[PDB]
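ok here's Protein induced by osmotic stress, seq below lol
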Amino acid sequence: MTTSVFVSGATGYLAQQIIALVLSKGYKVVGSVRSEEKGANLKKLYGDDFSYEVVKVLEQKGAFDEALKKHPEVTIFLHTASPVTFEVEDTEKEILIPAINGTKYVLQSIKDVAPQITRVVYTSSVVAMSVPEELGSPDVVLSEASWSSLSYEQSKTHGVLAYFGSKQFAERAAWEFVEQEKPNFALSTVNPVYIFGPQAKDEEVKGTLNHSAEMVNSVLKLNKDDDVPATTGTFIDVRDVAKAHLAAFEKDEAKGERLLLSNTRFNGQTLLDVVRKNFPQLADKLPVGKPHSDDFSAFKEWNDKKTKKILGFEYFDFETSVVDSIKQVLK
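and the structure came out like this:
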């Protein structure tokens, strides 16, 4: 009668947005959390239709088996969680293997213990699709077809490349599971770019005034003398990503799809120009740069046409996403 959706890594910024949307739709959520207190907090936040299970180590074999066994009511699994690593000493051991193993193990548990699950949505990234130099290139057109060229070997070399590799290999693992193991569920992925936007709950904006994506808040801590931030790429609003997750399990056309979630290009100047206009009280302590010096006109538009057609909604613009984040932080 009511449909129950499992969401891994439920305390996450995206996950919370997904959970809020889904609850708003009348689904139930069963959320995984790494501790009871995390769950209880989520419960207090999200209410009666929210339940939780504690799964401490996501990449462990059999990790989700008990939680799954307990929830025969669940028929959707949104796998949003990533391994939490705090500073990395060995890239393979701590980043690549956990990412890859986790995906395989979670899928195996679902097949093993939740045969009733008909849809799995795996949260991937644009980093699966590409390499860092290609991300910044005006000659590059990504699509839903795009797979990163980065090798396993190269991925080990650096922490950045490792994060890139980890997503690529993990997503490949997920598709591979589907091919090889042939489960009851249809798989789909969501592949976001830099995510901006408000948090699902005010209470969560803790510590008061923060930033993931931090890039929003690399700026607000700047000082008038500081440089304009370097960071540049494509953005997407967290709400749009969430809506993509919804469509990814709801729509027949999304079955076996990769969804590229990417909106407009930005740089530090784009960000600064927005903040400065919208929140003038902070302009005195902020840098100026060269306003509206950002010109992205040479950049080839990415090919997300299939994804937009499947999604069938229009995205939040950049200004709106940024303004909404700051307003909340300020509040």
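fwiw Residues 91-113 form the longest helix (23 residues). kinda neat tbh
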